[PDB]
Each structure stands twice: as structure tokens, then as C-alpha cells.
């Protein structure tokens, strides 16, 4: 009796059938109040546990305890029903229980179905009604490379063009924003730089991208270029600001088509 | 203050991880900062957190502050400038009357925790 899977599972099965039969005696006791069911279930479970003696699987103990609790309640209720030959307390459950057809401790469907039905069937209050009349009264890298290629083509390796004259697309604010998107996401790659012209206007020139045969070497070069002193000039670009830049830097054509 | 409380100004990083020097002229209005990592944007957040009396373990990328200095460098500089709110009061060099405060955290590789 120490570890036979068959014994353990048969204990499980007998106990489950025991649970079903105890639910039957649940209703039996609710109508009547028999103690023999409780005592016999106690004996059955104890005998099965005696067989489980030496077998040591937790679930069997858990379910046995469930049985214990159920049987103890069975016995106590049956004794209460034995002491004298309350009735409403019996009845309301029975009312609830008889409104419990189910297939054969929460609140059932027809429980409240019956109860409300009964009251309606019997209420001396007449029913009521209502109404309403009167109350009725390309992915990212591809666009990135396209825009930066156009920028490099119209910029030149050392030619300098003022920043707004390039970033702005005067024909569309949305296209200008997309162009700035692409331009910045290729600036991560490191083929262009920004300097200052004689008048102090920020002019972009092509930062000659050092040809690195190894991709890792090119990535390290990009990381170093990003690590350079980043003059971070951040300006809000809205339609009023976009047109202000258009008028300030004399921008007439889309730099990045 | 004229701006909203705790308005940040340009932040200067120096000898940080890879950034020997950089300065970000920040924006008091809005910041829709879009872009992935590769130069340490999460490391940038760690820098901002640690340089302002914040434990880096809030995210957990890198823990020891002295290691945030650039490789080959034992001293890094973090100048974070804030438009001092009237709320900040009764602290060293801190008053409601104060306008701009520059927290210059010096991270030393010989010190586990930096000197603000």
C-alpha cells in the first residue's frame, strides 16, 4: 500500500461516486433528514483511507477531507432534524431546491425564477407599464535612403545649403515631416554633417562617409559619429512654423521628392 | 517661474559611455522623441535618471555609476539645467526665487557614486 497507482485512482473514483451519492443524500436530508447516510459515508471514506494508509498522494488527502467536511455537516443536520418531528428554513431551501431542476452553493436560475413567478402570480399589486410619448417632447529604411540620396544629390560633397532650404518641402507639411524623418534616420548612418555658414545659418554638407569594408567597422564608425559633439538644435515644426521657415530661408522646391 | 515648473534647459554630457561631449538644447513645449537605440537612448535615460538622484535600477540596464563613464575615461560630466520651480525651497542653492539651476554631476571611476 505505498504507491500503487491503481489503488489511488480507484480511491479517487469511489470517492467521486461517493460525492455524487452524498449529493443525493443532501437532497434526501433536506426533504427528510437521515443520519444513516452520514454515518455510512463516514465509514466508507474511513475504510478507503485505511486502504490509502501507506499511500501518500496529497490529492487523496484533500478530497478525503472534503468528504470529512461534507459528512460532518450531514450528521449535524440529521441530528437537528432528529431532535424533533425551521420548517420554513427547510421549506425555503426546498423552495429553492425544488426550483433547482438543473441537469438533475451559488444562486440558481430557476430559484429566483420560481420565487418571482410566485409573487407575481399572487401579488395583490396590479402590474404596471410605461411608455415614452410626452417624455418624448516603403518601410522606414527605404524612404530614409531615398530622401538622403536626394539630399546628397542636391547638396554636394562640400557644398553647403541652409538647413530649412533642405528640410522644408513647401508643397506639403506632411511630406516635409516625412522628409525630416528620413533625413534624421539616415543621419544615424553618418554620411552628412552640419556646419555654420558665414551668416550663421546652419548649412548641411556631405560628411564624406569613410568606406569601411567590414559592416562592423562601419557600425563602429556610425557609433563614433553619433558620439561626436551633437549640437542638438530642436525646433518645433508645425504648419505655421513650417511656413515661417519657408519664408525665412527662401524655400521654393521640394528638396526630397 | 515664467515657464512650467521644472523646465529643463540644454543638457551637456561629457565622457559618457561613448559621448566624449554633447549638448541637447531641449524643448519646454513638447518632446515626441522617436527613434530606436544604437547610441544608448536607454543609456541616455539612465544618465538622466542617475544625474538627478535617481537609482539606475528603475530600468536596470547598467547599475554602477562609475561604469557609465566613457571607456578610457575615469571622469564624466553631466550638466542638467532646470528652470527652478518655486516649489523647490529650503535646499542648498535652492529657493523659490531661483531661476535656473545647473546640476553638474561629476562621475569618477574611483567613486561608486558620483559627486553632484
Amino acid at each position: 500500500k505505498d504507491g500503487d497507482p491503481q489503488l489511488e485512482f480507484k480511491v479517487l473514483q469511489g470517492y467521486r461516486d461517493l460525492e455524487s451519492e452524498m449529493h443525493k443524500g443532501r437532497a434526501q436530508v433536506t426533504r427528510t433528514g437521515d443520519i444513516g447516510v452520514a454515518m455510512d459515508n463516514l465509514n466508507a471514506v474511513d475504510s478507503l483511507f485505511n486502504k490509502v494508509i501507506g499511500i501518500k498522494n496529497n490529492g487523496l488527502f484533500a478530497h478525503d477531507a472534503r468528504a470529512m467536511v461534507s459528512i460532518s455537516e450531514l450528521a449535524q443536520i440529521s441530528v437537528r432534524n432528529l431532535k424533533f418531528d425551521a420548517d420554513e428554513q427547510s421549506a425555503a431551501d426546498q423552495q429553492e431546491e425544488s426550483d433547482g431542476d438543473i441537469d438533475r452553493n451559488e444562486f440558481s436560475q430557476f430559484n429566483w425564477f420560481r420565487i418571482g413567478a410566485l409573487y407575481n402570480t399572487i401579488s395583490k399589486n396590479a402590474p404596471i407599464t410605461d411608455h415614452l410619448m410626452g417624455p418624448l417632447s516603403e518601410t522606414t529604411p527605404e524612404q530614409v535612403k531615398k530622401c538622403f540620396k536626394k539630399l546628397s544629390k542636391k547638396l554636394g560633397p562640400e557644398g553647403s545649403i541652409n538647413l530649412f532650404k533642405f528640410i522644408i518641402d513647401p508643397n506639403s507639411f506632411s511630406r516635409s515631416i516625412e522628409n525630416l524623418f528620413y533625413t534624421s534616420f539616415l543621419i544615424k548612418e553618418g554620411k552628412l554633417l552640419m556646419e555654420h555658414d558665414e551668416e550663421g545659418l546652419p548649412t548641411i554638407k556631405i560628411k564624406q562617409s569613410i568606406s569601411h569594408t567590414d559592416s562592423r567597422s562601419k557600425e563602429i564608425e556610425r557609433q563614433r559619429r553619433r558620439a561626436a559633439h551633437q549640437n542638438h538644435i530642436i525646433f518645433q515644426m508645425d504648419m505655421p512654423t513650417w511656413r515661417k521657415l519657408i519664408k525665412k530661408y527662401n524655400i521654393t522646391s521640394p528638396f526630397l521628392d | 517661474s515664467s515657464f512650467q515648473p521644472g523646465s529643463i534647459i540644454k543638457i551637456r554630457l561629457q565622457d559618457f559611455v561613448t559621448y566624449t561631449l554633447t549638448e541637447f538644447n531641449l524643448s519646454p513645449s513638447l518632446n515626441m522623441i522617436i527613434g530606436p537605440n544604437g547610441s544608448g537612448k536607454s543609456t541616455f535615460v539612465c544618465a538622466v535618471c542617475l544625474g538627478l538622484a535617481g537609482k539606475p535600477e528603475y530600468i536596470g540596464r547598467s547599475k554602477k555609476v562609475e561604469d557609465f563613464i566613457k571607456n578610457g575615461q575615469d571622469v564624466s560630466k553631466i550638466e542638467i539645467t532646470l528652470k527652478n520651480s518655486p516649489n523647490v525651497t529650503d535646499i542648498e542653492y535652492i529657493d523659490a526665487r531661483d531661476e535656473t539651476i545647473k546640476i553638474t554631476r561629476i562621475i569618477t571611476r574611483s567613486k561608486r557614486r558620483s559627486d553632484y
Binding site: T140, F173, S174, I177, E178, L180, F181, S184, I187, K188, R226, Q230, I234, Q236, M237, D238, M239, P240, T241 | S27, S29, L30, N31, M32, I33, I34, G35, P36, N37, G38, S39, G40, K41, F44, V45
Partner: peptide, 24 residues
């Protein structure tokens, strides 16, 4: 401040805002 890896189309914008771009 809001940190994003990428950006999408159809972004209705206004004036008081200030769109950024974190580079890393």
C-alpha cells in the same frame, strides 16, 4: 517627453506641440 523607436503616418498636428526625434 515620449520615447518611440519609429513613427507612423497620419499624425494630426497642432501648434503648441513640439515633435521630437531621439537619435540612437
Amino acid at each position: 517627453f515620449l520615447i518611440t523607436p519609429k513613427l507612423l503616418t497620419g499624425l494630426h498636428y497642432h501648434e503648441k506641440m513640439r515633435i521630437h526625434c531621439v537619435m540612437a
